[PDB]
Design a protein around this ligand. Structure first.
Ligand SMILES: C[C@H](CCC(=O)NCCC[N+](C)(C)C[C@H](O)CS(=O)(=O)O)[C@H]1CC[C@H]2[C@@H]3[C@H](O)C[C@@H]4C[C@H](O)CC[C@]4(C)[C@H]3C[C@H](O)[C@]12C
Ligand SMILES: [Mg+2]
Ligand SMILES: [Zn+2]
Ligand SMILES: [Zn+2]
Ligand SMILES: [Zn+2]
Lengths: 334, 45, 49, 102, 92, 49, 49, 50, 69, 243, 389
RNA sequence: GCCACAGAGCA
């Protein structure tokens, strides 16, 4: 079977069993035509920052590879070096640099070139491989302030250094390439720092592109994950008040009661988060069986704002294909 | 060159060779060195 | 009574059966009565009068 | 020009006739080892396909392929990589068709 | 008044000659570090930090069987880990 | 508190028992070449083996 | 052959510091000896140490 | 000169509001109960006696 | 001392929800459990980021050394 | 020990070795001496080695053996309801050998519905990977929890809950692997038998294989403790109250 | 044990912790108050200055690196600020005035031929005291003190040299005058430390442990929503130690985060388990806090439900950066001509009576001779054959 | 730098 059964104390049938050698029939040999016929993609939602889509009739290894590549192998642009001029804040320089490196930047990674590490620092950063962001905030006491006010936004002028203060400074040909798509943070309301009068922040951040495995600030996804499609089988009819109890073991939109026969039936198993409450009660034993479809993945890819989640998934598929091609083209050394 | 801060009255002040270690606007005797003007580099990690 | 009632795939029961960590007494203390406290070979001494 | 340091055949673990072999791959991890294991295991001539990361500190992957006498392990590895490319192409085509549809 | 440290006081106790400098004593070429698990190591293997391995040294005498290796270690230097820190000539 | 007594007892036992060894005539002797046991344990068998 | 081979390799090897081994094999179990109050065969008033 | 204990009745921090504590560079959540001798803050521990 | 920019577990940017959370509790008088849901924090790892946050920056800024207190 | 060089600023030893040291990883610090003489180096490696000191001299029992989180994984592999197909079997065998050793797959225990291997066959392969391996060990031993069979005339292997372990050749025919068979303090263990019959190197190899297998297996086959494992049932609270 | 380890937790100290110059101060960058509070916490105002962070904990056996109290950390969680701390140290100098009407001086900055300071004076400033905000490596000078030789007088150089394994930044420089009219200079250095292998963590129920491995987010297990644990704890620490309070803390924290209210774990009371189970059921989770996780390595469902939820963890002051030590050859004592004591004097480790006796029990004579004579205090001496002296 | 004192780490 292909249904991961869910019991009250254990999870059964979790390993894929589609390969020759599993049975004497010697079936499930790799055929690209059968996979092309069986594989399906169903898009349920496609927003600017979130995509939800079902992959049907694909193996667990490939879906997990897609998830891992989206998390740690798809490049994105984040701040890497911070040069400080007169950081007078109570926030330390290391903490402020870390926070600036953690903001997401709305830069297409395809427009930047990878930075050669072995090159010296005098010629390491070019206009093709570095984006310079300037921050300059001074806090002054407000003269036209309310008499009895206590809000920091009225007693002071720049008491909150936000992410939108990271202005973009074009360098060289970036004045033309970045003309229609200026560099802005994806979340301009990020509270980078708080100030009081007499305090000043002035800094230049060099931003490069890297992969999420090196540092978590380069991951282009808020979260990239999948969950198998739940499956509830009502083996025997459940009628009457118990059916109402059978409705309370699940989220409200999962299982409904027919008006005519007054019996419970599954309405939307997608909403069914597996809390396995129904297995606690002895009255529903030998009446309900829970499982998950092993080859029905529901990907929910939430982007960090740099680029669209569908682009992230496409880049992950392309990265896996390029890894396979690179290993195929390499010679084998003894 | 303005280089020092009084820890109480928070006023910029500088010390000569013969000047005592005390503020000029008040008698407070604790002075904090101000932040340098040199570039300091940090990695965002 | 407690030990014979625990179902299989019970983690303290498995760890006591393996001998990897714990014992039957610890499981009986966690799930059932902790039992008499022995101080210097006797029960609790009279701290007060 | 070719990368001679990427994939190696460990001679101390391979067989005389090439039926069983072990390959060491640099700068790879589970995200390719698991896919290669799944694809190569679907070959009817392969009886032992398994990968391992000997140490998390080393970015390394050892994959062992033992076959029957009909095909060598190198042919099994190449066929598995080609089939993985075909799988990725099929997934890419279906995904872009569904994005263009809606 | 603190009593003086006589000859008998220098010979007895845990901090004396016998129990502090003769039976047990401070040794060179030793390191102390917090331990953490590693199941991938063989049971007859311990993992030493790269920083510790660049301080703890072994004096290898140059033979006809290991001349090239020690030449490479001398070329690598004290900073690159497969290297050497000191050289003692035969006549020096 | 038991560690102090254990350490002192171990120190005493080892200072009393360090000199013994099994010679090549299978007789356990002290450092002054005096016999404690003619055959180790009456049979000359290692507890380790 | 197996029995005779096991017997010949079970003999105490000459040169062994068997006194130090015995001293450690007595001293070390004192560390794991936790407190217990014992009684002499069903008499709850003797309390042998 | 008696070295006074912080937040006692002879101290400057006695029954002082948070603004005064901010002016004197002292934390309002500091428990007190110690002597500042030669810059080092020392606490007289409570003693059991018969 | 200040709200983290990113949630530790997943990576969601929660640093921009602090001011809105404070406004929802102060102005709209919403409970803490509904204000978190209104800000898009569904996963509990993100909710504990600004539900457990102790804003020590305001207390530290009382002792500013460059301006009388 | 033999030194390996790693970049993470801590000493690292295998968890089968922390039992002679009485050491646990919660802030423990150890010392590392480097002998500076060839004679001292040889004496240390030949008389003080981990391979040559697998038995304590207090009683001759093994002291370097399976510890916690290795006994539990071995028990879950060797549990009677553990059936693996060829893909899972092969993955587990590559997990214990780092993709180096050659494995001769034995015929499966179940053939008609599917082809399934029992975890006892996995441990049989762990003891003896291929026909070139010389490790052939035979032993009969009792587990920590042994429930005797229904009739006293029946032998010990016919007991409930797989109390009795029997190894013939290198195949495991009965029983589960626990502290009595893989752990320390018993003279009827697998590693003790390998060390006595075929030397210390084979025992060290088997211990390394078991450590790698149980270090990579329990991650992919989860094992957790929760409050459901501690809460008593409804009928227990009445029996306890009345007693 | 946790009464012992609560006093070693790294966290906020006071509201004026950045105006203080103490000899050793550990501060946490992002402290958080716990979900499962106590009435005593509110009465002593511990929630105002917390010491610890709420970590998503999955109680499971992930690898072999969680054996014997060791913990598995998430690399992406550390990169986002989990467990980040800073260490602040104080160096004080007094420019004392001698009886010969001579005093110590601080000024001096040796410039090279080009017009830049030398490497030892790279962050030393014109006035002789190091500049605030600049990095100081090992061998550099941040206080350039000079002492008169006779105490036009001649001053010898006795600088304050920074010697440490990692670079530090000058955070504060303070000059003042003591009660006896002597110049007093205090330099406060800071260094930022992130969690690594060997860093000690506690869980407020005892359960101390060091990090065994730091693995990536992709290698961690995950649930349906994509939540990734920050710390993975071995299940084997619970049966022999019987910390059911940790389990109740996990469930109470989960129910409190989902409901939006901090929970109470007060002794002889607190939040009952049935209410938190009801909250978890109403939120779509399991009543026992056991979630169903997919493995990040293989992608498949784990064959056991994983106990998953927030636990308050404390980072202790015992970090491997201050514990690692190695000597080789170095200073020796003037009296016994043996290596010194302590890592602060580049000292050596002691091969005491017990270790000597263990080596005796092994029978290694040459090893004992090398350790106790060759490597410590070997000495070639003349012995008379007649009188013996 | 010497000397005591004080606290802390691991069973
Ligand atoms: C990054 C990449 C170029 C790499 C050099 C470009 C070239 C091909 C481009 C995709 C295709 O256009 C199909 C599709 C169109 C939709 O409208 C938006 C999404 C899709 C998936 C595209 C995304 C992205 O734009 C791709 C992959
Ligand atoms: Mg310990
Ligand atoms: Zn002033
Ligand atoms: Zn989150
Ligand atoms: Zn003479």
């Amino acid at each position: 079977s292909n249904i991961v059964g869910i019991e009250y104390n254990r999870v059964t049938n979790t390993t894929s069993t589609d390969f020759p050698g599993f049975s004497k029939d010697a079936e499930n040999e790799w055929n690209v035509e059968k996979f092309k016929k069986d594989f399906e993609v169903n898009i349920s939602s496609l927003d600017a920052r979130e995509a939800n889509f079902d992959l049907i009739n694909i193996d667990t290894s490939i879906a997990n590879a897609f998830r891992r590549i989206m998390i740690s192998e798809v490049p994105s642009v984040a701040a890497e070096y911070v040069y400080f001029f007169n950081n007078t804040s109570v926030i330390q320089d290391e903490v402020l640099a870390h926070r600036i490196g953690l903001v997401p930047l709305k830069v297409d990674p395809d427009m930047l070139t990878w930075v050669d590490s072995n090159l010296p620092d005098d010629e390491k950063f070019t206009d093709e491989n570095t984006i310079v962001l300037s921050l300059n905030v001074k806090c002054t006491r407000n003269p036209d302030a309310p008499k009895g006010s206590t809000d920091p936004k009225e007693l002071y002028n720049n008491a909150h250094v936000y992410a939108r203060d990271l202005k973009f400074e074009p360098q060289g040909r970036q004045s033309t390439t970045f003309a229609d798509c200026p560099v802005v943070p994806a979340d301009p309301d990020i509270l980078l720092a708080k100030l009081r009068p007499g305090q000043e922040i002035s800094l230049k951040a060099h931003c490069i592109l890297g992969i999420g495995g090196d540092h978590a600030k380069f991951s282009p996804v808020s979260t990239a994950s999948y969950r198998l499609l739940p499956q509830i089988n009502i083996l025997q009819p459940i009628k009457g008040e118990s059916a109402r109890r059978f409705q309370k073991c699940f989220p409200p939109g999962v299982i409904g009661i027919d008006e005519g026969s007054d019996e419970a039936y599954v309405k939307d198993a997608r909403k069914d988060t597996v809390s396995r409450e129904v297995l606690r009660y002895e009255e529903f034993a030998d009446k309900v069986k829970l499982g998950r479809v092993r080859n029905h993945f529901i990907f929910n890819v939430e982007s960090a704002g740099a680029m669209t989640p569908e682009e992230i998934f496409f880049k992950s598929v392309r990265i896996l294909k390029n890894k396979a091609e690179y290993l195929k083209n390499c010679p084998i050394t003894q | 060159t303005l280089k020092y801060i009084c820890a109480e009255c928070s006023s910029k002040l500088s010390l000569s060779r013969t000047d005592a270690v005390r503020c000029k606007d008040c008698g407070h005797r604790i002075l904090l060195k101000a932040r340098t003007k040199r570039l300091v580099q940090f990695e965002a990690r | 009574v407690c030990i014979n009632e625990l179902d299989n795939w019970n983690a303290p029961l498995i760890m006591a059966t393996c001998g990897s960590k714990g014992s039957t007494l610890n499981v009986s203390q966690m799930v059932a009565v902790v039992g008499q406290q022995i101080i210097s070979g006797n029960r609790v001494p009279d701290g007060f009068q | 020009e070719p990368d001679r340091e990427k994939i190696k055949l460990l001679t101390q673990a391979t067989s005389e006739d090439g039926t069983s072999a072990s390959f060491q791959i640099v700068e790879e991890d589970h995200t390719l080892g698991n896919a290669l294991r799944y694809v190569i295991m679907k070959n009817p001539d392969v009886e032992f396909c398994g990968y391992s990361i000997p140490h998390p500190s080393e970015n390394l992957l050892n994959i062992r392929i033992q076959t029957y006498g009909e095909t060598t392990a190198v042919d099994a590895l190449q066929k598995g990589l080609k089939d993985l490319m075909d799988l990725c192409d099929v997934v890419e085509s279906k995904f872009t068709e569904k994005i263009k549809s809606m | 008044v603190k009593p003086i440290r006589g000859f008998c006081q220098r010979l007895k106790g845990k901090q004396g000659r016998f129990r502090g400098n003769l039976s047990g004593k401070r040794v060179d070429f030793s390191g102390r570090t917090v331990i953490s698990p590693d199941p991938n190591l063989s049971i007859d293997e311990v993992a030493v930090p790269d920083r510790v391995a660049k301080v703890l040294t072994y004096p290898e005498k140059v033979t006809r069987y290991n001349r090239h290796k020690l030449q490479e270690l001398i070329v690598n230097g004290p900073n690159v880990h497969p290297g050497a820190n000191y050289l003692l000539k035969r006549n020096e | 508190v038991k560690t102090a007594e254990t350490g002192y007892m171990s120190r005493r036992l080892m200072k009393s028992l360090e000199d013994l060894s099994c010679q090549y005539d299978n007789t356990v002797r002290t450092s002054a070449n005096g016999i404690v046991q003619f055959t180790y344990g009456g049979d000359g068998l290692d507890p380790l083996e | 052959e197996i029995a005779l081979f096991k017997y010949r390799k079970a003999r105490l090897e000459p040169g062994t510091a068997i006194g130090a081994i015995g001293a450690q094999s007595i001293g070390e179990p004192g560390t794991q000896m936790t407190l217990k109050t014992f009684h002499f065969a069903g008499v709850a008033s003797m309390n042998v140490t | 000169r008696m070295p006074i204990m912080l937040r006692s009745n002879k101290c400057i921090l006695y029954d002082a509001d948070e603004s005064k504590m901010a002016k004197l560079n002292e934390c309002p959540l500091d428990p007190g109960g110690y002597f500042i001798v030669n810059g080092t803050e020392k606490v007289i521990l409570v003693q059991e006696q018969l | 001392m200040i709200v983290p920019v990113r949630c530790f577990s997943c990576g969601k940017v929660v640093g921009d929800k602090w001011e809105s959370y404070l406004n929802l509790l102060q102005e709209d008088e919403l409970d803490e459990g509904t204000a978190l849901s209104r800000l898009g924090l569904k996963r509990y790892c993100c909710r504990r980021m600004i539900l457990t946050h102790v804003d020590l920056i305001e207390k530290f800024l009382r002792y500013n050394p460059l301006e009388k207190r | 020990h033999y030194a390996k060089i790693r970049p993470w600023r801590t000493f690292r030893l295998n968890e089968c070795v922390c039992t002679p040291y009485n050491a646990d990883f919660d802030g423990d610090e150890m010392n590392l001496h480097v002998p500076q003489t060839e004679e001292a180096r040889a004496e240390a490696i030949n008389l003080m080695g981990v391979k040559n000191n697998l038995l304590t001299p207090k009683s001759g029992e093994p002291i370097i053996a399976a510890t916690q989180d290795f006994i539990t994984g071995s028990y879950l592999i060797s549990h009677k309801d553990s059936f693996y197909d060829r893909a899972t079997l092969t993955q587990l065998l590559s997990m214990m050998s780092d993709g180096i050793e050659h494995f001769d797959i034995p015929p499966p225990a179940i053939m008609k519905p599917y082809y399934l291997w029992t975890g006892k066959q996995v441990f049989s392969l762990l003891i003896k990977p291929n026909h070139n391996s010389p490790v052939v060990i035979n032993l009969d031993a009792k587990n920590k929890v042994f429930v005797p069979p229904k009739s006293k005339s029946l032998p010990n292997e016919m007991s409930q809950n797989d109390g009795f372990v029997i190894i013939r050749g290198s195949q495991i025919l009965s029983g589960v692997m626990d502290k009595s068979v893989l752990g320390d303090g018993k003279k009827h263990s697998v590693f003790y038998t390998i060390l006595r019959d075929y030397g210390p190197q084979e025992a060290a190899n088997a211990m390394n294989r078991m450590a790698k297998l149980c270090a990579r297996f329990l991650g992919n086959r989860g094992f957790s403790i929760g409050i459901n494992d501690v809460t008593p049932a409804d009928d227990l609270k009445q029996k306890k109250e009345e007693l | 044990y946790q009464c012992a380890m609560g006093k070693q937790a790294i966290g906020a100290i006071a509201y004026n912790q950045f105006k203080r110059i103490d000899t050793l101060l550990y501060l946490m960058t992002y402290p958080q108050q716990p979900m499962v509070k106590t009435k005593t916490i509110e009465l002593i105002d511990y929630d105002k200055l917390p010491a610890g962070q709420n970590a998503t904990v999955a109680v499971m056996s992930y690898s072999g690196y969680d054996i014997e109290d060791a913990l598995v950390l998430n690399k992406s969680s550390i990169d986002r600020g989990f467990g980040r701390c800073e260490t602040r140290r104080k160096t004080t100098t007094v420019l004392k005035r001698y009886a010969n009407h001579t005093q110590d001086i601080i000024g001096g900055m040796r410039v090279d031929e080009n017009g830049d300071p030398i490497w030892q004076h790279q962050s030393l400033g014109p006035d002789g005291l190091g500049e605030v905000g600049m990095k100081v490596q090992s061998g550099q000078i941040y206080i350039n003190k000079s002492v008169p030789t006779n105490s036009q007088t001649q001053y010898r150089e006795a600088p304050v040299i920074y010697r440490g394994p990692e670079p530090s930044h000058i955070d504060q420089v303070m000059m003042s005058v003591s009660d006896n009219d002597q110049a007093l200079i205090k330099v406060l250095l800071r260094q930022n430390r992130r969690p690594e292998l060997g860093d000690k963590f506690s869980s407020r129920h005892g359960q101390k442990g060091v990090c065994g491995i730091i693995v990536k987010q992709e290698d961690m297990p995950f649930n349906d929503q994509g939540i990734v644990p920050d710390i993975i704890m071995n299940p084997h620490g619970f049966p022999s130690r019987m910390t059911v309070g940790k389990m109740i803390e996990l469930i109470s924290g989960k129910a409190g985060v989902l409901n939006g209210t901090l929970e109470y774990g007060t002794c002889f009371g607190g939040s009952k388990l049935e209410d938190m189970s009801k909250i978890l059921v109403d939120q779509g989770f399991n009543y026992s806090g056991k979630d169903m996780l997919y493995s990040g390595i293989t992608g498949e469902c784990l064959q056991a439900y994983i106990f998953f939820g927030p636990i308050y963890y404390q980072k202790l002051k015992h970090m491997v950066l201050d514990k690692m030590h190695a000597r080789a050859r170095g200073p020796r004592a003037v009296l016994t001509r043996q290596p010194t004591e302590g890592r602060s004097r580049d000292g050596g480790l002691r091969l005491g009576e017990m270790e000597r006796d263990c080596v005796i029990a092994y029978g290694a004579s040459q090893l004992l001779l090398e350790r106790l004579m060759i490597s410590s205090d070997a000495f070639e001496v003349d012995v008379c054959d007649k009188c013996g002296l």
